[PDB]
């Protein structure tokens, strides 16, 4: 299993501003987190290039026209992978309610058994606790790509103010990792998908596009 | 062998201050290095959560109540793994003398043959030379986790001084990597162990705890 | 295949200055890129320590006195690995012309079939597009080490000006990754090769050495 | 029974600072008092010189390699001596929990009968109430040394400030007393043990040593 690890580095301050604005405008019917924006962005990204969201059979490979995103949730019994289907068609409040409902279902017991079967990309995120920057779980056998998300730190970013020739103003910054299979997805298309994903995420206004 | 790589990023300036104070107070009977603090901290960390320090047999797994730490040393013949046992009970001067004596034994020849058998976590550190930030040797077959340590760089860290709204003051910072097995230790407990390890190391005053 | 991933972090501003000077002095007969300096530097580095540029047969291993560098190029059909031989003897303009000619040959069709066989280290570099910092393709079967190159970012670097006690002046900085085999090349010699490679690259004036 | 009384005078302000720091950093799982630092320090001190922690049989004497510390607790029924074993191996939070649990066990009733047998040095401390500076209970028959602790007062300590040729700044100060047997432990080794104990306690940073 030749799984090569690529990475990217994303600026999220715009996402924080948008999340705060939407949460303040909310009347309580929905709750938003950064994982919501990440899953919507990666759904749009997979719509952009369908190469990443494929599967490998015995010899032959199959490509999915639609997008099905599996999210990892931590349970005392082990690792659970709830699924959400048709993410591109849905908004972000609906997927928010779906993921929180699936999480609480995992808390109170076991889920309906076909919530485990299916999917195109597996997503894991321990950004809640600190002391984690990079990680990559093994790719699931029916999958072809896994995207892992670390925590958000606070580092200096290039700025070109006039009074200060160099200038230093700080921004929040996050690290993502992607493990592919190299049997279906090669390095070039993975780098393309990552760069266009960063292009989508850096300015969130194109999420509605 | 699904070995997933997690990482953390540690501040060591407090450790440097403590090491300098103890070395100045020393009368020559003991010599201290950063590896000493790392091995003591990880011993306490394994005491905190015993899940990481286990082993896998044919099908069944075995959990060790005590801690046995194997340290990697570079030799012209190859790679050697001296062992230290009961690290949690011992202080740091005793383990310091033990590791330096084992290192010089490796220099002058071969060791007693049962110094190779046993252990719970393997530790490797090439922080002596520069030009290394991340690395991860393969996990030893009777082990379940390996922690590798890079070098210490000097980077900017968040500060909240009054005169400067952003403010910039620099600190030394180190990178650690952890390769687990995923047959015994899953991602969640590994992240827990790493975050509590960083909590222990960041302020060294809890080492005596 | 126990492929352990080591990394380094290089300052390239001197290389940019030298590249700009040589390109301005050029009359059009040659074109220079950062990949040229990297391949020349790694050729000299392999000349420094011949351990990395070896191959593994069935049980026995073979060491190459000369250097043969294979460079990866992205093609719509897939991944292509043109080869350049005797790089240490040649300058940098000759290897520049050779690599650009091989790239355009890959563009317009297929190459002469023995351009695929041979080599000591495989080099891949997607530094052209942004949104990539670390990656590592699997080592080719007749090879023993692969060096991957990310993009160049702009980060703060330690400075010791008098007026500012800390001081902050920024520099361009690049990330490199190295995947070895651990059947032939162990961690120590890999770290040695990486540190001496960084020593060569940081100040490019030793390239002519 | 020729029990000669030696004494020492200790500065504890550093211990108060360390205790306050650790208690503030505590999340409630442990509670620390000065007696904890004293018992850990004397355990390390007995490890330093094993002469004090011995016992006398009929004619012959026996020396203990390990350390077992008996602490005196005041009960309405009389005087009770709970025991803690292997103190040097354990930290200070574990012995803290052990001593508080033994104290509350003495409060709610009688203890398991073998908690009375064994030990190397008996420790008594009425530092809680004021109006006590020196005291010394008789040595227990199977013991060879008893260390009693008074209360902490506030007295002037030598200082060498520049503006004030003499200078006066005040510090907290405690008095300790030691009654030996003179059948096993003579004056010289007792004075050695006391001076090295004061050396350990005055700067608590060597407790982790």
- Best A74, A78, A131 residue to mutate vs chain B (most B CBs within 10 Å): A131
- Distance set, CA B22 to CA B39, B103, B173, B202, D204 (Å): 17, 22, 21, 17, 11
The response to whether B23 counts as a known ligand-binding position is no
**Which method, experimentally, gave rise to this model?**
cryo-EM
Distance of CA B11 to the CA centre of its chain: 14
The response to whether C11 counts as a known ligand-binding position is no
Of A129, A136, A156, the CB nearest to B191: A129
For residues B127 and B149, the answer to whether their CB atoms sit within 8 Å is: yes
Of B18, B88, B206, the CB nearest to D25: B206
Q: Where are the alpha helices (DSSP H) in chain A?
A: 13-25, 34-48, 93-108, 187-202
H or E segment and range at residue B176: strand B169-180
Judge: C4–B74 Cβ closer than 8 Å, yes or no.
Answer: no
The tokens for C128 are 């052209």
C170: left (phi over 0), alpha (psi -120 to 50) or beta: beta
The tokens for D38 are 């004293």
- Distance set, CA A111 to CA A51, A56, A99, C20 (Å): 30, 27, 13, 61
- Chains C and D touch, contact meaning at least 3 pairs of CB atoms under 8 angstroms apart: no
Largest distance between two CA atoms of chain B:
63
Q: Give which of B44, B123, B124, B53 is closest to B90, Cα–Cα.
A: B44
**Given resolution (angstroms):** 3.8
Rounded Cα distance between B5 and D112, Å, is: 49
Reported residue count of chain C is 209
Of C158, C166, C198, the CB nearest to B131: C198
Strands (E), D3-58: 5-11, 54-56
Q: Identify the residue whose tokens are 């995207």.
A: A147
Give Cβ neighbours of residue D37 (< 8 Å, ≥ 6 apart). Answer: D15, D18, D19, D92, D201, D204, D207
Rounded Cα distance between D122 and D83, Å, is: 9
């Amino acid at each position: 299993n030749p799984h090569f690890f690529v990475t990217s580095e994303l600026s999220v301050s715009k996402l924080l501003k948008l999340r705060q604005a939407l949460n303040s405008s909310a009347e309580g019917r929905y709750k938003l987190s950064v994982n919501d924006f990440l899953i919507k962005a990666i759904a749009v990204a997979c719509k952009r290039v369908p190469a990443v969201n494929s599967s490998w059979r015995d010899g032959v490979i199959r490509q999915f026209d639609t997008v099905d995103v599996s999210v990892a949730v931590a349970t005392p019994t082990g690792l659970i992978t709830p699924i959400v289907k048709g993410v591109e068609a849905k908004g972000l409040e609906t997927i928010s309610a779906t993921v929180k409902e699936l999480a609480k279902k995992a808390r109170d017991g076991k889920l309906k058994p076909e919530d485990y079967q299916g999917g195109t990309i597996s997503i894991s995120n321990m950004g809640m606790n600190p002391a984690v920057e990079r990680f990559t779980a093994i790719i699931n056998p029916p999958q072809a790509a896994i995207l892992a998300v670390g925590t958000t730190k606070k580092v200096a970013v290039p700025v070109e103010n006039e009074d200060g020739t160099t200038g230093v103003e700080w921004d929040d910054q996050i690290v993502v990792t992607a493990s592919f299979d190299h049997k279906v997805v090669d390095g070039a298309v993975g780098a393309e998908w990552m760069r266009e994903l960063k292009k989508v995420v850096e300015n969130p206004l194109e999420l509605l596009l």
